[PDB]
Structure formats: structure tokens, C-alpha cells
Amino acid sequence: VEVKKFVKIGRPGYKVTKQRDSELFQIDYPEIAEGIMPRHRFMSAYEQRIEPPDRRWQYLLMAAEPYETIAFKVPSREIDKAEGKFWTHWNRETKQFFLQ
């Protein structure tokens, strides 16, 4: 409750770059100067501010404390894993966030 109320929200413009891999998205974020890594989570389209019709898909959204959350819709059922400690990385030297 204390961390959610003291979180500043200016909502800057994020820069996401997707690429279809085969065996992965790159989000360019500014310097946050904190140890809190940006977290990704997959949610449903049933909850919204206006609740539009025909919403039956899922969206993976990455969020950070000084920046706004960037969400990408996934029409497929399961093609990857949205876990944080499994297939995600955050280089604080170049401030590059990657998720596959």
C-alpha cells in the first residue's frame, strides 16, 4: 500500500522491438537508478477501463516503476513462457530488457 501510493507515474513513451525467433522482444528503457527490475506478467482482456466487446485474448505486459507498462497481445494459446526468472533478462549496464 505504501509502495503503490508513492510510485510516480508520468507515463513516458516506451520503445519495444519484437522479432519472431525460432529454436523474444527487446524493450529499450531509460536509467531508473534503482535495483527494482521491470517485471512482465500475462493477463486477460476481461478487465479494462472501458470493457470493450469481443475481448477474448491475452496480453503480456512489462511494467517498471519510473516508466509505463508496455503490453503486447498474444493470439496464440501457448508458444512461450511469461515467467520472470526463467526466460527474461535485464542488463543494467546498458539498461536493456529482453524476454523470450
Binding site: 509502495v3 503503490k4 516506451y14 517485471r39 477501463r49 496480453y59 511494467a63
Partner: peptide, 15 residues
């Protein structure tokens, strides 16, 4: 875990 459980998950933006 405390920062991930306190962020807003309703502010979705698709660019």
C-alpha cells in the same frame, strides 16, 4: 516481489 505485487496491471498500452 513487493514491487511486482503493488504495480498497476490495468494500465495497458499497445503500441
Amino acid at each position: 516481489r513487493v514491487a511486482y505485487a503493488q504495480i498497476d496491471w490495468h494500465d495497458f498500452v499497445v503500441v
